[PDB]
Each structure stands twice: as structure tokens, then as C-alpha cells.
Write a protein that binds this ligand. Sequence first.
Ligand SMILES: CC(C)CS(=O)(=O)N1CCC[C@H](NC(=O)Nc2cnc3[nH]ccc3n2)C1
Length: 277
Amino acid sequence: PTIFEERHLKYISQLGKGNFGSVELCRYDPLGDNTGALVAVKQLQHSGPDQQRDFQREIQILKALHSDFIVKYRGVSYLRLVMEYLPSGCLRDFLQRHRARLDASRLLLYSSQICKGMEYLGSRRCVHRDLAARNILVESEAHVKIADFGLAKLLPLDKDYYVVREPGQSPIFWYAPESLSDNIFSRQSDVWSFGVVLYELFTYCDKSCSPSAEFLRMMPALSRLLELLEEGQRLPAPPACPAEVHELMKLCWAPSPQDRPSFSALGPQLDMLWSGS
Ligand SMILES: CC(C)CS(=O)(=O)N1CCC[C@H](NC(=O)Nc2cnc3[nH]ccc3n2)C1
């Protein structure tokens, strides 16, 4: 349906948790005979005013998004947000687990699919604010989708960026410098993060050459990272990374947001790369 009744939603396990929310594996089972379809259900664990307003906005945002490369809204229950369920789980773990099967073509196919999802999102004036391979889902061997719009913001019609009051709670290594220094988030800070997803993809999310493992190697942690970045230090090309892919990462990592490519510019290049590979 679009409206699911709580009494029919049957708990199975936890898929994730963060902020003050959780996503659960449930079966929607109105017959009560275990033949119902599976769904992923988000709820809040905080009955406070601004977190509920946030959760409500999240629901409206995901409701109004329609992409093959964005996780599907199914409905709500009255409080809870119901979505399609992707058993394969997150791309980060998938990459670590299937490393030896997936060649550069596939890595490029995923890159392209994510870019496309983000181009669309940006066309809806939506900043995701937490793009990272741990937040991307595997629909199938050759199909991924973006997930967790828990921190996503809509840009007002008159402003192409958004300032946030409180500090971030996400791993610092995916943040654009202007986010680090000023809490400024834009579609162009999404592009920065996307560059770190490309890195993640072409390292297959290996922990030993992770963004974190690499910063700590390159020597308050947040301040230090900002300095590194301002001096022009950048993550080095993943092992056996095609150079053209590394170059795209470096463009995504341009100091100033206005000098980063758009998602609509990036996509054609990834497709050309995919086809040539
Ligand atoms: C709770 C939030 C902070 C994190 S989160 O959104 O729960 N999250 C993101 C994707 C990876 C994990 N998800 C996951 O393993 N499997 C899975 C399957 N189908 C789904 N449909 C909708 C979400 C979702 N997640 C945790």
C-alpha cells in the first residue's frame, strides 16, 4: 500500500542505526502466516520536536524522489517510514566481500549509477550531506542505489548552499573543506564526498588504505585534516587505479566548490571510461 498498519509489520532484525533513528527488517504480513513481503522500516527513538520535524521532512523528501538509483519509498505507518528492502546490504561490505569478481568496468558502472542518482537529487535541490559507500545499497550485481537521507536538506529557491548550526557526527574524512571550517553544505560538497566514494570504490573499501587510515598516516584531528587539505594534500591514487579515474577524483577535490565539476558533467566521462575499459 501507501499506508501500512503497524500491527501487520513484524520485526525481524536491525539493518542500521544512527542519529536518533533506526532501520529495521520487517515483514509486512497481514495474513500473519510468514508469506508477506519484506520491507525496511525507519523509526525515531526520540520524541523531541526538531527530530520529528526532521524525520517528517526526510519522509516528504524520499516520497518525492523517483530514481532507479535511489532507494524506494513504499509508504508510512502511523511515525514509521517504509521502504523497499535490499538484501545485499551496503556497497562498502559488498566491495570488501566480492573484491576478486569485480573489475574496473563494474566499479565504473557503479560510479556512473551513483553520479546519475546524485545528478537527479541535485535537480530536486536536495543535498544528501552524507554520501559514502556505507550509505549506498546493492540492488543487484550490476545495480546500486543511494540510501540514508537522514541528514539530507532541501536548498531554498534563492540559495545554493546551506549552513548547519551543530557539528557533524559522520566520519570527517568525507567532508569538503568548507563543511569542515564553516558547516557549509551544497551540491558541490556532495561532489567532494562523491570523490571520496570513487576512492572507496577503487580501493574496494579496503580498511588498510581507507580514507581514515590514509589521513592518520599523512599525520585536534579536524583542524589537522583541514590544514592538510588547504596545503593541497590529497588521498593518493588507489593501487592499480586507472589514472583517468584518479584525475576525476582530483577534480572532485578542487579547493573551491565552484571549480568542482557538476554531476551532469561527471556522468558522461564515467560512461566514456566504462565503455573504453
Ligand atoms: C540508520 C541509518 C543511519 C543507516 S541505514 O539507512 O539503516 N543504513 C544505510 C544503508 C546500509 C545499512 N542498510 C543495510 O545494510 N541494508 C538495508 C537494506 N534495505 C534498505 N532499505 C532502506 C535502507 C536499507 N538498508 C544501514
